[PDB]
C-alpha cells in the first residue's frame, strides 16, 4: 500500500536482509515474509529479487531453502507468470542437490498456488519432470 | 569435546600439506567446530608424519624404564628424548609394562 514513497533502491537492499530474516521459529514470520517478497516483486519487477531468491538455494540448512521456495511460489503467483519460469528451468542445470530440490519444490508450490492456470505450462515442465 | 574423527583428520592433513606449519587460523577456518589450538594439539600429537604411533621396540623401553625412575613425572620432558614424541604413548607403555610386571 505504500510502494511509491522510496527511491526504488530500498526494496532491493532489504530483500537480501529478508534472507537473514528467515530461520525464525514462529511460522508467522516465515509466512508473512514470502508475502513481503511477493509485493516487493510486484513493486519493482520480478527480475532482480529473483536472483536473490535463487541464490538463497545453497544454504545447507533447512527453514531457509524451503522458505525461499515459498518465496519463489509467491513471486510466481502475485505478479503474472512467465517471468520466473525460464530461470527456474535454467537453475536445474547447476550441478547441486539443493538448488534442484528447491526448483522442484518451487514448481510444486507453483502449481499448488496457481491451479487452473497450469493448462499452458504442463508441456513446458514435463521435460523437466521426466 | 574434540572427538576428532578421521574425516576431519584427513582434511587437516591436506590443509597442513597445502598451507604450511605455523599457519593455523587459515586452516581452522574450514572445520566448523575446531579452533587453532586443538588442531595444534592433535597435529603435534597424532598427525605429524615423524610420529612412531606403532612398532614398540626393546631399546626404547629399556631406555625409558630407567628414565621414568630418574623423574617419576615429566613424560613430555622425556618425549623428545625417547623419540616416540607422542607424549601419551609413553604413558600407555609405562602403565602397560607396570601391569605386565604385576599381573
Amino acid at each position: 500500500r505504500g510502494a511509491e514513497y522510496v527511491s526504488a533502491r530500498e526494496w532491493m537492499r532489504i530483500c537480501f536482509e529478508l534472507l537473514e530474516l528467515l530461520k525464525a521459529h514462529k511460522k508467522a514470520i516465515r509466512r508473512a515474509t514470502v508475502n513481503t517478497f511477493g509485493y516487493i516483486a510486484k513493486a519493482i519487477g520480478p527480475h532482480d529479487v529473483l536472483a536473490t531468491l535463487l541464490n538463497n538455494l545453497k544454504v545447507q540448512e533447512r527453514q531457509n531453502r524451503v522458505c525461499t521456495t515459498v518465496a519463489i511460489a509467491i513471486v510466481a503467483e502475485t505478479c503474472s507468470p512467465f517471468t520466473v519460469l525460464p530461470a527456474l528451468m535454467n537453475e536445474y542445470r547447476v550441478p547441486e542437490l539443493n538448488v534442484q530440490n528447491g526448483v522442484l519444490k518451487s514448481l510444486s508450490f507453483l502449481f499448488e498456488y496457481i491451479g487452473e492456470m497450469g493448462k499452458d505450462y504442463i508441456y513446458a515442465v514435463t521435460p523437466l519432470l521426466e | 569435546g574434540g572427538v576428532w574423527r578421521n574425516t576431519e583428520d584427513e582434511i587437516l592433513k591436506a590443509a597442513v600439506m597445502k598451507y604450511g606449519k605455523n599457519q593455523w587460523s587459515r586452516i581452522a577456518s574450514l572445520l566448523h567446530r575446531k579452533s587453532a589450538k586443538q588442531c595444534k594439539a592433535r597435529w603435534y600429537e597424532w598427525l605429524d608424519p615423524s610420529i612412531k604411533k606403532t612398532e614398540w621396540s626393546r631399546e626404547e623401553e629399556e631406555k625409558l624404564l630407567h628414565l621414568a625412575k630418574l623423574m617419576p613425572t615429566q613424560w613430555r620432558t622425556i618425549a623428545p628424548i625417547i623419540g616416540r614424541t607422542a607424549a601419551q604413548c609413553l604413558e600407555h607403555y609405562e602403565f602397560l609394562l607396570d601391569k605386565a610386571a604385576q599381573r
Binding site: 511460522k27 508467522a28 509466512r31 499448488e112 498456488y113 491451479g115 | -
Partner: protein, 100 residues
C-alpha cells in the same frame, strides 16, 4: 496432519458444528495443510464440539479465532465428505517440549 504421521483423526459422522482454527494455525488446511483456495467449511461431530471443547482449534486445541476451511484440492478429491477430521491424540510433538 501429514507432517507428523503418528496423529490420527476422529473420523466419525459430521454434523452442523463449524470447526475453528486458532491464531497460530489460521488459514491452514486440515488434510493437505495448505494456505490457498478455500472451498468447504469444516463440519465436526458433537463429541469433539461439546462443553469446554467449543470454540477450540482442530489441530492444536487452542482457542479458535477464524473459521476452518477445506481446500479445493481436498474438495475435488472429496476428502471433505469423509469422517470428522478432528485430531484427538498428541504425541512426540508439543509434549516433550514442555518438559524441556
Amino acid at each position: 496432519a501429514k507432517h507428523h504421521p503418528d496423529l490420527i483423526f476422529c473420523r466419525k459422522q459430521a454434523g452442523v458444528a463449524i470447526g475453528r482454527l486458532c491464531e497460530k494455525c489460521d488459514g491452514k488446511c486440515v488434510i493437505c495443510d495448505s494456505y490457498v483456495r478455500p472451498c468447504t467449511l469444516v463440519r465436526i461431530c458433537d463429541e469433539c464440539n461439546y462443553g469446554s471443547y467449543q470454540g477450540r482449534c482442530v489441530i492444536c486445541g487452542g482457542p479458535g479465532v477464524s473459521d476452518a476451511y477445506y481446500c479445493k484440492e481436498c474438495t475435488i478429491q472429496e476428502k471433505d465428505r469423509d469422517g470428522c477430521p478432528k485430531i484427538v491424540n498428541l504425541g512426540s510433538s508439543k509434549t516433550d517440549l514442555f518438559y524441556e
